[PDB]
Amino acid sequence: EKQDFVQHFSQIVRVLTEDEHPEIGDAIARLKEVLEYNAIGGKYNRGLTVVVAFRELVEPRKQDADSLQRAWTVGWCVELLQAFFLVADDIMDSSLTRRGQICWYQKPGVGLDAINDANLLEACIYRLLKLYCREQPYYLNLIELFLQSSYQTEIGQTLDLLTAPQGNVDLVRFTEKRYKSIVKYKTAFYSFYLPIAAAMYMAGIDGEKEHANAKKILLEMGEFFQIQDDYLDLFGDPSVTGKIGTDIQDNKCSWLVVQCLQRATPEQYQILKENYGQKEAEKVARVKALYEELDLPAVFLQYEEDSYSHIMALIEQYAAPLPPAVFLGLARKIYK
Amino acid sequence: EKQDFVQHFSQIVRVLTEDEHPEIGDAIARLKEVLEYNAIGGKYNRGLTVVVAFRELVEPRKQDADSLQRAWTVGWCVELLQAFFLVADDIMDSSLTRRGQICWYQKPGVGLDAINDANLLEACIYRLLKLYCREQPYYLNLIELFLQSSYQTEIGQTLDLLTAPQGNVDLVRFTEKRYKSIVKYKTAFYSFYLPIAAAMYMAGIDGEKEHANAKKILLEMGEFFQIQDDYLDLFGDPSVTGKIGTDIQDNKCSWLVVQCLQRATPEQYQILKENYGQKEAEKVARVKALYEELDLPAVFLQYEEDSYSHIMALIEQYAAPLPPAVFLGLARKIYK
Ligand SMILES: O=P(O)(O)C(O)(C[n+]1cccc(F)c1)P(=O)(O)O
Ligand SMILES: O=P(O)(O)C(O)(C[n+]1cccc(F)c1)P(=O)(O)O
Ligand SMILES: [Mg+2]
Ligand SMILES: [Mg+2]
Ligand SMILES: [Mg+2]
Ligand SMILES: [Mg+2]
Ligand SMILES: [Mg+2]
Ligand SMILES: [Mg+2]
Prior knowledge:
Two copies of one chain form a homodimer.
Chain A: H1 2-7, H2 9-16, H3 25-39, H4 45-55, H5 65-92, H6 114-133, H7 139-163, H8 176-202, H9 208-235, H10 238-241, H11 255-263, H12 266-273, H13 281-293, H14 296-318, H15 325-333
Helix pairs in contact in A: 4-5, 4-8, 5-6, 5-8, 6-7, 7-8, 8-9, 9-14
Catalytic activity (chains A, B): isopentenyl diphosphate + dimethylallyl diphosphate = (2E)-geranyl diphosphate + diphosphate; isopentenyl diphosphate + (2E)-geranyl diphosphate = (2E,6E)-farnesyl diphosphate + diphosphate
EC number (chains A, B): 2.5.1.10, 2.5.1.1
Organism (chains A, B): Homo sapiens
C-alpha cells in the first residue's frame, strides 16, 4: 500500500506548483521546496488510512480511476495537515530533528519564516480539495472536517503549552484527567478520527450516529497512540524514531511523568521536582533514572496490552455496521 | 459606524468562548485572552468595510436583524484574519510593537507559543462562519473566499521574505515589477477585495464578471494602501501608527527603497548598499538620510495624488453596476 501512495506524491507536488501567474514563481518554487522537505519521510499512517479505509468502504465496482484518485488525494491532504502541525510544533517545542533530519526551521536560511511555510502547507489541503472533490456531494463535509479537526488540535496544543509553562515547575498539574484531554484534542481527533471519517464521507456514509460510533473507537485508539509517542520520546531508538525527545526538558505533561508522579515517594517527588522541566542534561538524566527506577517501562508494556484489549472490545462493541477490518488494520499498524 | 461595530465585539468573544466541554476551559480562557489582545486596537477598516458595503448593497427592507448580524459577524471574520496574519507577521518580522502596545509574542510568558495562538485566530473565522451563515446560500463562497485569500497572502508574504533575505544585501532585486506582485498578493487581496467580495456574496451578487470588475478597482486600491504603509513605516508618527518601522533593518523591498534605487547615483547606491538591511541604528539612520536627500517624501506625495486619480477613473470605469459609494467610501478612508 505504502509505495503506490508515495508514488502519487509527484502528482500532488506538480499540481500544487502547477500555476505558471509567473509573478509568484519564486514563491511557488519555495512551496514545492517546503512540500518535498516536510511531507516526505514519515510512515504515512494517516494518508494510508484514508486510502485503505476507502477501498474497504466503497463498492469495488464503484472504484473508478477518478474516485480512486480523489481518495489518495484526500490522503495526501491528511499528510499535509500533519506536515503543517509538525513544522510549527518543532518550532514551539524548539526541536532539533524530525523524521531523521534537522527540523525545517533549523535549516540555515529558514528559521522563523517556517511560520509562513507551515501556513502554506495548511493552505494546500484546501487547494487540493477544491481541485479534485469540488463537484462531489461531500466537498463541504471534508472541508468542514479538516477545519474543525485543525481547531481541535490547536486547542489540544494550547492545553499542552499551558500545562508545561517554561521556567515554571508545573508538577502539580500533571494529572490523568488533564493528560487525557490534551491527548484527545491534540492528537486523537486528527490522527485517528480525521482520515477515517474522511473515507466515510467519501463513501457516502455521513450519518451522525455511525461517525460517533467510529469516533468512540478511534479516539481511544488515538490516546494509546500518543501514550506510545511519549514512551518513545524518552525510551526509543532515535535512529528508528527519526527525532529526539524533549518532553522532560520541555516540562511536558507526559504519560510517563504522570505515571512517575502516581508511583513516587516524597523522596522521589522532590527528585522529580528539582529535575523536571530543566535544560541541564544531567538533570534530564536524573528523571529518566527515576522512571527506570519506578519500573515504568514494564508499566507501559502492561498498558499497551490492557489498552489493546479495550480497543478490541470497542471495535467489537461499535464497529458495526463498518467492516471490522477498517479498525483492526489501524490497530495492527500501531500495535507495534 | 466604527462604534456599533466595536460594541458587537463582546458578542463575538462570548460566542467563541461559549462552549463550557469544560475539559478545554483553560484553553478557551486563553483564546479569549488572545482575542482581546489582538483583535482590538486597530482601525477596523476591513471589518467596517464589510458592514458598510452590505448596507449599500442589500435592499433596506431586506436588512432584518438576523441578516444585519451575519454582516458584522463576517466583518469580525475579516478582522480575525487580520489578527492572525499580524501575530505571525510580528514574529517573523521580529517586531517590537503593534497598535500602540508590545507585540503579543514579546509579552513575558508568550514568545513562540504565539504561533499556536495565531492558528487559533485563523480557526475562529471558520467557527463564526458555520455558527451564523451555515444555512445561507453563500456559505461555501465565503469559506472559499477566506481560504483562497489566506493562501494569496501567504504567497505574497513568501515573496516578501524571499526578496529580503537576512544577512544578504539584496539591492539588485528591489525592482518595481517585484514590488507590485508582493503587494498584490500580501496585502491587496485580503485587505481590499476580501471584505467587499464578502458583502457582494452576502447580497446575492456572485457573478464572476462583477467580482472581477470590483477586483480591478480594489486591487489597485490595495496597492496604494501598502505604499502608504511603507511610507509610514519610516516617515510616520509611531504614536499615531502604534508600531515602529523595521523595513530598512529588515532589508525589505519597500516602495521607498525601490524609489531611492531609481533616483540614486552610483555614490548614493553604494551608500544604500553598505547601509540597507543592517541592525546598526546609524546605518539605518544613514538610509533615511539618503531618502530625505532624494526628495522621496515629495515623490510619495506626488504619487498619492497621481494614484488617487487613477483609482477614481477606475471606479468610474468599473464600479457599475454597484453603487459608486461602495468604493468612494473606501478611497476616502484610506486617502488620509
Ligand atoms: O512527538 P511529537 O513531538 O511530534 C508530538 O506527539 C506531535 N504532535 C502531536 C499532537 C499534536 C501536535 F501538534 C503535535 P507532541 O504533541 O509535540 O508531543
Ligand atoms: O506594517 P505591517 O508590518 O503590518 C505590513 O504592512 C502588514 N502586512 C501586510 C501584508 C501582509 C501581511 F502578512 C502583513 P508588512 O507586509 O509586514 O510590511
Ligand atoms: Mg513536538
Ligand atoms: Mg507538542
Ligand atoms: Mg511527542
Ligand atoms: Mg510587519
Ligand atoms: Mg511583513
Ligand atoms: Mg509594513
